[PDB]
Amino acid sequence: QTDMSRKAFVFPKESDTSYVSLKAPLTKPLKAFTVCLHFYTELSSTRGYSIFSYATKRQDNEILIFWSKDIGYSFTVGGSEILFEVPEVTVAPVHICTSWESASGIVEFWVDGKPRVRKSLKKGYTVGAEASIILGQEQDSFGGNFEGSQSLVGDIGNVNMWDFVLSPDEINTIYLGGPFSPNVLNWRALKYEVQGEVFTKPQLWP
Amino acid sequence: QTDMSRKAFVFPKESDTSYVSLKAPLTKPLKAFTVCLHFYTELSSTRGYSIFSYATKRQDNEILIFWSKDIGYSFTVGGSEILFEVPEVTVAPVHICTSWESASGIVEFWVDGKPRVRKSLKKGYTVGAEASIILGQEQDSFGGNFEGSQSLVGDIGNVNMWDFVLSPDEINTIYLGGPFSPNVLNWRALKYEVQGEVFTKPQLWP
Amino acid sequence: QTDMSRKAFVFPKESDTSYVSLKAPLTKPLKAFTVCLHFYTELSSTRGYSIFSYATKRQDNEILIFWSKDIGYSFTVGGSEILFEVPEVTVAPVHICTSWESASGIVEFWVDGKPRVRKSLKKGYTVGAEASIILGQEQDSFGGNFEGSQSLVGDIGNVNMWDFVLSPDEINTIYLGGPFSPNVLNWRALKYEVQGEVFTKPQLWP
Amino acid sequence: QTDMSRKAFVFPKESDTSYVSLKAPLTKPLKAFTVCLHFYTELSSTRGYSIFSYATKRQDNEILIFWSKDIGYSFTVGGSEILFEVPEVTVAPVHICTSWESASGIVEFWVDGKPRVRKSLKKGYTVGAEASIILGQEQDSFGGNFEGSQSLVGDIGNVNMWDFVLSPDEINTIYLGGPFSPNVLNWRALKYEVQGEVFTKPQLWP
Amino acid sequence: QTDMSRKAFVFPKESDTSYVSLKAPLTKPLKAFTVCLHFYTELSSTRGYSIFSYATKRQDNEILIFWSKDIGYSFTVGGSEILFEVPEVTVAPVHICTSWESASGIVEFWVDGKPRVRKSLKKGYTVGAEASIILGQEQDSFGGNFEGSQSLVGDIGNVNMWDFVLSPDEINTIYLGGPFSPNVLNWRALKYEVQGEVFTKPQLWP
Amino acid sequence: QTDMSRKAFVFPKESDTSYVSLKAPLTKPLKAFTVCLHFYTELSSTRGYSIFSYATKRQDNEILIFWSKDIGYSFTVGGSEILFEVPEVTVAPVHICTSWESASGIVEFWVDGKPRVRKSLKKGYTVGAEASIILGQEQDSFGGNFEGSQSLVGDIGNVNMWDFVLSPDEINTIYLGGPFSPNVLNWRALKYEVQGEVFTKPQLWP
Amino acid sequence: QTDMSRKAFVFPKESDTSYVSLKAPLTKPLKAFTVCLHFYTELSSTRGYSIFSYATKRQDNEILIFWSKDIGYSFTVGGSEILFEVPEVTVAPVHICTSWESASGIVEFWVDGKPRVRKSLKKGYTVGAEASIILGQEQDSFGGNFEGSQSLVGDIGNVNMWDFVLSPDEINTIYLGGPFSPNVLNWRALKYEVQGEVFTKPQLWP
Ligand SMILES: [Ca+2]
Ligand SMILES: [Ca+2]
Ligand SMILES: [Ca+2]
Ligand SMILES: [Ca+2]
Ligand SMILES: [Ca+2]
Ligand SMILES: [Ca+2]
Ligand SMILES: [Ca+2]
Ligand SMILES: [Ca+2]
Ligand SMILES: [Ca+2]
Ligand SMILES: [Ca+2]
Ligand SMILES: [Ca+2]
Ligand SMILES: [Ca+2]
Ligand SMILES: [Ca+2]
Ligand SMILES: [Ca+2]
């Protein structure tokens, strides 16, 4: 339990050893989730990179937020991927947010408070519970096989993961700075560990 | 009666089975009408899609709001259509509303509160009374013949239909959120039914 | 001419020298009028005060919006007054405004968008054209005889006056913030002058 | 005499029969004039069209406000014309107003409150009095010879014509909506006549 | 320098020894100021207490935010006091903020984002620079003479003092949690000192 | 002596007879000056033109503000000129202001309140005392030799000439409208003379 | 000691004699530093130029803020250089400044308050103490060898050097105008010396 308020992780150089793991105290399978966070990187025009990696035993790409080169964010559940295209690119800390529900397959997506159209992905799926979370590397296995081309170089922080779908009002509250309380991955009581060259510095985004 | 406030229908996948019907129990022909509604989709740059379909026995496209690819909205009365060109495209929940009158043929059109140039269409026509309304599919018959290419993928809600022409002040009130009361198709007294995969979710637009 | 958008006048102390005059370039008698404006003061529980004063040569109280103590607003035309009772009092920027017509004498009244019952006052009257408008003081003459007990201490702004009756839709538009264009006293082209301790400050009400 | 406040003419289709006449009660030659009017059309990118036509006996193009294709408005007095070039085009109700003075030849021009550079045209001219005004058609004779390609399709209203030069303050007052009093062509006491399919509808512009 | 984010001071018992001093690095006299701060106490119904005390050499009550028993907050400048009455009392962390300008004497007041009417106080005054700030005690001298009856028992934090007047939008951002940067008394770089039984604990208000 | 406030000169046609002369009552040579004024023309996309011409006996181009075509303003002192690049052009009344000091050669330049980079020109020069000022024509001699291609067509006014370097805050007050008092060429006490077609009209810029 | 508030240095011409020297009273090696300053020049589109030059005995390019042509600013430490590209260019007084720490090699970058992505540079380096600072010239030796092509022509001022890393809040305070106190190079007690044609003039940026 460590309060990471106003602090964010820093990935200055690309390497297959700089990464952090996150421990989820949840012991029940997931029927719905909502995981989003802040990040600031410059690789949005040079090569692809991962943002949030959630890999389990039977699947190395259970939940993976990946940024496709010249397309945009590529969200995926269980292995099937959907594309959220963007015709332009900016240089600023982006705060995207997405949700998912197995009961209806709706996949919401937000970009800096602006919402995107809902899509279907893995209707009736069942996300596991015992899994490993890696921020900065796209693991192709349960805790390893990091891709140098898919690695992340920049800043990252304010990770929050729920176990249900958040209303638009709750998403606006998260984007603005209002009070909240996660139940799966709390940024105020995160239980993480540092591996490689991962330094903690104050956040740049307000 | 079912109150659909703050809720909207969602269409994540294109299909000829995902659609809803709207009951119009009015037993009097229509000499004028006005319908405003919200919609949020990204198909404005890939292929055409339908928005509002009002089909009767003698005509499948009595009142039909269609989005033509690379031109814009294509409103039609009785079968003859007019074009409202838009040189650019945006990514945001758009709120359109149009009017029509048989006594003068004037066809108004509003896009997010901004008015468009008036046009003449079907002077002296007589819209029927008994009809079927379908949101998301272009029905080429009385309750069937849905086109997969003309289907809709996105969100839709707050559909309200009157039986006369609304003043510009009334249209501004509708766009802002002020009080109102439709007399043909009320979003607060909608009598609808679910067919296919059509779920109710909170609206994204404020 | 001076654009007074987002700005309002302030009266911090009660005095017979702090007041502002408003020049109406109209040269035609008025058979109907409608003026709406904002005001925020705390004198609603200690003593009476004036809000909108419109005095002419033959009558010092042609159009005068006064707040009577322990009853409410006291609107008057030509000298005859009517009472709009309020059993309670609030502490917030209140937006009230009324209308009047000589053809029928109907006097509407609105309080923060909520309408009041219509009343009759001065059926067949003829409001003069050459007159002086004073905001903050109850003038008992053509530009003088200011009452210290009836003076105003607080804020005032967004004064807009028409020469006809506004529909409920236009009233709701004014209350919400939609576009409009006054034709008697425009807040965007107000031709006023400062006298006494009257400072310009940003408005508190949204 | 008919009050045309908040109402405007509608030209939905192009034709040589759709036009309106305006009766000027002035019986004295004109040494200066100023006309402001609203108009909302979509023909600003397809073909030219007329806005204000003032033709007399000895000249069919005494005063003619014409919109040239791909350049802009082409104002003219007596027969000699000058060009007010616009490098871009918009889609919104535009409010133009221009002035002229025979004593100095100065030709002012305003576009939505923004002024244009002054120019000279017909120094020492003398505009006649007995003439016919046509809104929507470019007449090539005294009350006839309407051009099909030079027709107007859209809305028009709030036409006011003075007999002198208006100060920039008065022009801003007109643009914002403030009080005024014409003496040659009053929109509040217009004496007009209808011909063809010309319907009166509430204005779209605020 | 010490960052006091998410932390607040605690005054559990009334004593003439428990207080905190604040060092202002400003060496220029003040013509305007604005102090927003949080506080949560229960003495709002038992006896009076001080909130913000700013005393100098020539005046022991230069700037003093005091809560009068059964009346409300009693703001004062230089020695002249003004009353902001409130007929109701609540038990919750209240966020008040006030401003002042020597050029106009206007003194604003905000209570949990809700604004109060503006008043005049000490027009043309000049607040000194070399002074001592004490939170929790009403000092009757330059660093002493604390009143046990006027002492404070509760929590206080997030004190921020500017050197000018804040706009309503800035006050709204302060109350909500938006970014800001003080120039006289920064809660993120407070240079304070502890005295007596004053412990730092996480804040209760969100 | 005459007040030229709120009025500006008008040049409707290009001619070698339209110009205005200004008498400077100063009988001492100039070591520094500051000259700025308002102007509104459309020639900035067709051909070059002069703005402010200050010619003396020994030099026809002592101080001359010229607008080069496809580059921008070309300031000069004594005969040596410099270039101020503007990669774009606008259609609006532009208010530039520049200064110069012989003791350091520094020449400043402002554009509608926005400042430009500092440069050096004629270090140690000595501007003469007796001269003729011509607005609208580029004189190649002491009161003659006007170039038709370098003439000015548009409006001009607000001419002010100091005899030293003005501070940035003074430039800001000049651009906004604050009080000032020239000592060489006052717009409130200008002693000018008319020649050609030069009419006085109210200014368009606020 | 000299207070250089509201004043800035001016380099009007490129030359090998115009430069300013800065004396650092620090006698301890630097493990972290932070330089912030203002600058306004027009050479950002013609050729490269230096901004901040910090050369030592064993290294002529220890700390050098250089603007590379058609890419952007090129910060370097010890000899290794990293490029901060900018796809566009502006004409305005720009305020950029960076930080650095040898403990982890993290290097920040801010552009008018907007932060840039963090990078690694010279992990474990040790910046010397006895060095010479030159503003306007890129010294290739300890106090000489200035490049004419790399010289600076424009304005510069408000130079402040710390000996640690500044928080984002402190950076925002510096950018806004709040108080601060350097410990190695204070703009309020700068110990400099003039050489060549370097004149002091009031700053243009607010
Ligand atoms: Ca994988
Ligand atoms: Ca991989
Ligand atoms: Ca059909
Ligand atoms: Ca079909
Ligand atoms: Ca009276
Ligand atoms: Ca009285
Ligand atoms: Ca003709
Ligand atoms: Ca023709
Ligand atoms: Ca005291
Ligand atoms: Ca006491
Ligand atoms: Ca010459
Ligand atoms: Ca020449
Ligand atoms: Ca070097
Ligand atoms: Ca070099």
* Owner of token pair 């406040």: D5
**F148 close to D (CB below 8 A):** no
Resolution (A): 3.5
Chains that touch F (3 or more CB pairs under 8 A): D, G
Separation of alpha carbons F189 and G2, rounded Å = 43
**Tally of residues, chain B:** 206
- Biggest CA pair distance of chain B: 41
Neighbours of D6 (CB within 10 A): 16
- A183 in a known ligand binding site: no
Q: Which helix (H) or strand (E) holds C176?
A: helix C168-176
> Cβ of D115 and F154 within 8 Å?
no
Say what the alpha-carbon torsion angle E111, E112, E117, E121 is, to the nearest 10 degrees: 40
d(CA E51, CA E38): 9
Shortest CA distance from G168: residue in chain A: A204
Element (H, E) at G199: strand G199-202
Please judge whether D117 and F40 are an interchain contact, meaning their C-beta atoms are less than 8 angstroms apart: yes
Consult the annotation and say whether E59 binds a ligand.
no
Ligand number with the minimum distance to the CA of E134: 9
Q: Is A45 on the interface with G (CB under 8 A)?
A: no
| G13, G42, G203: residue with CB nearest F117 | G42
The residue among B5, B44, B91 with the most chain A CBs within 10 A of its CB, best to mutate, is B91
Main-chain dihedrals φ then ψ at residue B59, nearest 5 degrees = -150, 130
Q: Give the C-alpha separation, B173 to B189, whole Å.
A: 20
D190: distance to nearest CA of chain F, Å?
30
Q: From the CB of residue A56, how many other CB atoms can be counted at a distance below 10 Å? A: 17
Cα atoms found within 13 Å of the Cα of residue D170, Cβ hemisphere only? 18
A197 is in an annotated binding site: no
Contact residues, chain E, for C194 at CB < 8 Å = none
Question: What distance separates the 2 farthest-apart alpha carbons in chain C?
Answer: 41
E118 interfaces chain C, CB cutoff of 8 Å: yes
CB G51 within 8 A of CB G152: yes
Distance CA G145, CA A162 (A): 62
Q: With an 8 Å Cβ cutoff, are B168 and D197 in contact? A: no
First-last CA distance in chain C: 24
For residue F193, the CA-to-ligand 11 centroid distance in Å is: 22
Give the span between the Cα atoms of F13 and F10, in whole angstroms.
9
- Name every chain A residue with its beta carbon within 8 A of the beta carbon of G118: 10, 12, 154-155, 201
The answer to whether chain D touches chain C by having 3 or more C-beta pairs less than 8 angstroms apart is yes
Q: How far is C201 from chain E (nearest CA, A)?
A: 9
- Closest-approaching ligand to the CA atom of D150: 8
Measured between alpha carbons, how far is F143 from F57 in angstroms, rounded to an integer? 10
* Alpha-carbon separation of residue C49 from C39, C69, C93, C121, C154 (angstroms): 12, 8, 15, 22, 10
Selected residue of G82, G118, G164 to mutate for chain A interface (largest A Cβ count, 10 A): G118
| Minimum Cα–Cα distance from F171: chain G residue | G204
Task: Provide the shortest C-alpha distance from residue A168 to chain B (in Å).
Answer: 6
Q: What is the DSSP code string of chain E?
A: -B--TTEEEEE-S--SS-EEEE-----S-BSEEEEEEEEEESGGGTS-EEEEEEEESS-TTSEEEEEETTTEEEEEETTEEEEEE-S----S-EEEEEEEETTT-EEEEEETTEE---EE--TT--B-SSEEEEESS-EEETTEEE-STT---EEEEEEEEESSPPPHHHHHHHHHT-----SSB-SSSB-EEEESS-EEEE-S--
3-class secondary structure, F123: coil
Name the residue facing C12 among E116, E118, E168 (closest C-beta). E118
Residue C116 CB partners (closer than 8 Å, separation 6+):
C84, C108, C109, C110
| Residue among E1, E6, E203, E204 with most chain A CBs within 10 A, to mutate | E6
Contact C66, C73 (CB under 8 A): yes
Q: What are phi and psi of G19, to 5 degrees?
A: -165, 165
Closest CA to E137 of E46, E9, E6: E9
Give the method of determination. Answer: cryo-EM
Looking at beta carbons, which residues of chain E come within 8 Å of A6? 5
The answer to whether G18 and G147 have CB atoms below 8 angstroms apart is: no
Burial class (CB in 10 A: 0-12, 13-18, 19+), C155: buried
Strands E80-85 and B114-115: unpaired
**Residue C5 backbone zone (phi > 0: left; psi -120 to 50: alpha; other: beta):** beta
Ligand 14 midpoint to CA G58 (Å):
16
For residues F73 and F87, is the Cβ–Cβ distance under 8 A? no
Contact (Cβ atoms closer than 8 angstroms) between residue D192 and residue D2 = yes
Binding-site residues of F, please?
60-61, 138-140, 150
Name the residue of chain B whose CA is nearest to D156's CA.
B117
Q: Is F167 on the interface with G (CB under 8 A)?
A: yes
Beta carbons of G10 and G81 less than 8 angstroms apart: no
Distance from CA of G85 to the nearest CA of E (A): 28
Q: The tokens of G151 are what?
A: 């010289």
Tell me which residue of D172, D161, D95 sits closest to C191, measured CA to CA.
Answer: D172
Residues of C in contact with B176 (CB under 8 A): 173, 176-178
**Gap between the Cα atoms of C85 and A103, Å rounded:** 55
Whether residue D12 and residue B119 make contact (CB cut-off 8 A), yes or no, is yes
Cα distance between residue F150 and residue F142, in whole Å: 16
D36 in Cβ contact with D171 (< 8 Å): yes
Name the nearest CA neighbour of E60 among E160, E119, E122, E146: E146
Q: What is the spatial distance between Cα G73 and Cα G41, in angstroms, rounded to a whole number?
A: 14
For chain B, the distance separating the N- and C-terminal CA atoms, rounded to the nearest angstrom, is 24
Across the interface, of A5, A179, A206, the residue whose CB is closest to E179 is A206
SS3 string, F60-110, reads CCCEEEEEECCCEEEEEECCEECCCCCCCCCCCCECEEEEEECCCCEEEEE
Between CA D65 and CA B106 the distance in angstroms is 26
Ligand 4 centroid – CA B139 distance (Å): 7
Q: In this structure, how many other beta carbons lie within 10 angstroms of the beta carbon of residue F203?
A: 20
Amino acid sitting at position G195: Q
Cβ proximity of E64 and E162 under 8 Å: no
Name which of G62, G60, G98, G58 is nearest G78 in CA terms. G62
- Interface membership of D119 toward F (CB under 8 Å): yes
Nearest to E10 by CA among E36, E49, E40: E40
Cα–ligand 13 centroid distance for F11 (angstroms): 57
* DSSP-derived 3-state class of residue E88: coil
Q: From the CB coordinates, do chains E and A have 3 or more pairs under 8 Å?
A: yes
For the annotated binding site of G for Ca(2+), the residues are 60-61, 138-140, 150
- CA closest to C9 among chain E residues: E118
Q: How far apart are CA D150 and CA D140, in angstroms?
A: 11
Q: Do chains D and B touch (3 or more CB pairs under 8 A)?
A: yes
The helix (H) or strand (E) run that includes residue C68 is strand C63-68
Strand F49-55 to G7-11 pairing: unpaired
Whole-number Å distance between alpha carbons of B154 and B136? 9
Contacts C167 to B, Cβ<8 Å: 167, 169
Amino acid at position B201, single letter: K
Q: Does G204 touch chain F (CB under 8 A)?
A: yes
